[PDB]
Write a protein that binds this ligand. Structure first.
Ligand SMILES: Cc1cc2nc3c(=O)[nH]c(=O)nc-3n(C[C@H](O)[C@H](O)[C@H](O)COP(=O)(O)O)c2cc1C
Ligand SMILES: Oc1ccc2c(O)cccc2c1
Length: 378
């Protein structure tokens, strides 16, 4: 029976355990170029046969909504990534690049020529939320511009190019960021998508864009090198269950048509504890609803399932042992615990993470200077 520390065949790739580095935007890729800081950060977190997913990576100049996040749409960026990927591979890691377009979750300061961010809609994220600016202040999300159909195809092409570039850099594959209210989610979620054309209305129409992206990148680099991340549960849908199942149905159908499986489906879940980790005491209620959603979605998807969001050591063990997921990703714990895999294997204490340096730009401080367990001198 599978455990969290058991080997796994993720289609093309042999993994030695089920602990995954979740994608984590950290803003250390100064002027969008992966650098020596990123090399050491991913190297520190690499294990033999361990799966790593990079921070969200720009597919185009309009795809940014954070400062000093890496791109993979220029040769200079590809060359920077090669150094990261080579180091991870030297440690025996398998590593995927997350392809990220933020859509309306941006600001004029992030956009070429100060243009409006692009989206499904003209409606902005409400003033309830604010955006981190390059000068360490917080700003207001602006009104986005709704894409025309031909422009949506231009973005699909940007994903295709980014995937090709990822493989050129040596990445084992890519993950489509279709979660957390960013561009593709702005089309999926009926709370955001108020379009009246062929990209709006039906679940079929709302899933069109993300399916076109999956189709294009699969054609470019192979189904077995493509993972997809979603989060159906200011980005809400009136029926998260049906939305998740709608995406899953279309992925299953595409796999059956093309004759092979995608690398995986990756789904995040919300939590209801004070610190966002773990389970509430035996008898919230929204937690059981969400728990059931995750099992329903996994059950419906034909292939590898990665769960993420508030997983503890115990909940990760249970998810794999009970068959709820094949792989378990960890985000915040991996910020502060470079050797998180070893710490989980030993049930060792976990370093506290410092949220104040999640998105600062120092190559060392709060980035590569969290300690591993003392290995001593053999
Ligand atoms: C600082 C930070 C950066 C993140 N960056 C990304 C990202 O670039 N792409 C993404 O899909 N999720 C991102 N996430 C969400 C995480 O991947 C993860 O789903 C979330 O932190 C919940 O998992 P956890 O409880 O293990 O932290 C980020 C989260 C944090 C805290
Ligand atoms: O707390 C979060 C959750 C998701 C995120 C994402 O999808 C991209 C960048 C930063 C993020 C921060």
């Amino acid at each position: 029976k599978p455990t969290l520390f058991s080997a796994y065949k993720m289609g093309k790739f042999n993994l030695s355990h089920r602990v995954v580095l979740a994608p984590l935007t950290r803003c250390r890729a100064i002027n969008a170029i992966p650098n020596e800081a990123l090399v050491e950060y991913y190297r520190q977190r690499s294990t033999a046969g361990g799966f790593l997913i990079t921070e969200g990576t720009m597919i185009s100049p309009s795809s940014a909504g954070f400062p000093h996040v890496p791109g993979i749409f220029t040769k200079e960026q590809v060359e920077g990534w090669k150094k990261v990927v080579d180091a991870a591979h030297k440690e025996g890691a398998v590593i995927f690049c997350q392809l990220w377009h933020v859509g309306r979750a941006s600001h004029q300061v992030y956009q070429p020529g100060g243009a409006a961010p692009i989206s499904s809609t003209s409606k902005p994220i409400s003033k309830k939320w604010e955006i981190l600016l390059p000068d360490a202040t917080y700003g207001t999300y602006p009104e986005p511009r709704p894409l025309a159909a031909n422009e949506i195809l231009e973005v699909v092409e940007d994903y295709r190019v980014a995937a090709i570039n990822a493989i050129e850099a040596g990445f084992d594959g890519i993950e489509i960021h279709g979660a957390h209210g960013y561009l593709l989610d702005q089309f999926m979620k009926d709370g955001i998508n108020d379009r009246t054309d062929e990209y709006g209305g039906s679940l079929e129409n709302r899933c069109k864009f993300i399916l076109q992206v999956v189709q294009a990148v699969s054609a470019a680099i192979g189904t077995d090198r493509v993972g997809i991340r979603i989060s159906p549960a200011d980005a809400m849908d009136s029926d998260p269950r049906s939305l998740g199942l709608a995406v899953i149905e279309r992925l299953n159908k595409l796999q059956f048509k093309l004759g092979s499986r995608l690398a995986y489906l990756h789904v995040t879940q919300p939590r209801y504890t004070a610190d966002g980790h773990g389970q509430t005491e035996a008898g919230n209620g929204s937690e059981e609803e969400v728990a059931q959603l995750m099992k329903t979605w996994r059950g419906a998807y034909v292939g590898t399932f990665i769960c993420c969001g508030g997983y503890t050591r115990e909940l990760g063990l249970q998810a794999v042992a009970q068959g709820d997921a094949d792989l378990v990703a960890f985000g915040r714990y991996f910020v502060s615990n470079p050797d998180l895999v070893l710490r989980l294997k030993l049930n060792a204490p976990l370093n506290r993470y410092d949220r104040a340096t999640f998105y600062t730009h120092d190559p060392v401080v709060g980035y590569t200077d969290y300690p591993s367990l003392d290995k001593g001198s053999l």
